[PDB]
Design a protein around this ligand. Sequence first.
Ligand code: GDP
Length: 192
Amino acid sequence: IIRDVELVKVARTPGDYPPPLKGEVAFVGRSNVGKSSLLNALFNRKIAFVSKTPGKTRSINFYLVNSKYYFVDLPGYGYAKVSKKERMLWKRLVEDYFKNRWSLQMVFLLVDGRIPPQDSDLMMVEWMKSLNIPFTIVLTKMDKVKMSERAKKLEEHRKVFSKYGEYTIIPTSSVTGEGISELLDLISTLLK
Ligand SMILES: Nc1nc2c(ncn2[C@@H]2O[C@H](COP(=O)(O)OP(=O)(O)O)[C@@H](O)[C@H]2O)c(=O)[nH]1
């Protein structure tokens, strides 16, 4: 049960992270995948910025939850015409985070449920595997998947992500609430 959510750190440079406390989980995915919307659904409040147009990579944001854990919002990758400077910033921040944040318990990798897994997502998977970073796949935007196509598409994500490694796969919709409570429970378990 999430009681309190506070934005406490906007990290713009490597290593500018708050004290580890009791642990944390992180969220990442392609820009526009629905990360801010998912965070808001999890927090049960509008706090992360939602938009049809993806924001530039600028920071890693730390949300202090119940005064003892963090939900960490990593910047989205790909999509926009990411300039050299922006991708370098992206790489610089996320790599620093992965390599140095020992208290990270789990990364939730958000991917669009509506289409099959894509190359940049698979690259993300390979990278975290190489860094020994645990991760769980979260499918987003499930409310837009035709009921008659849900089975095929879910199997496709399962098949693809099984050729690799993973913690589990949770379909979600920030619109209907599908999977939100299941994701919350898994997080509570990982943290406690
Ligand atoms: N139908 C639907 N739209 C969503 C869902 N999640 C996000 N969106 C929309 O997708 C667009 C991107 O959302 P956003 O949360 O800002 O993505 P972000 O760039 O990953 O943080 C927005 O227009 C959202 O309204 C979802 O579960 N269902």
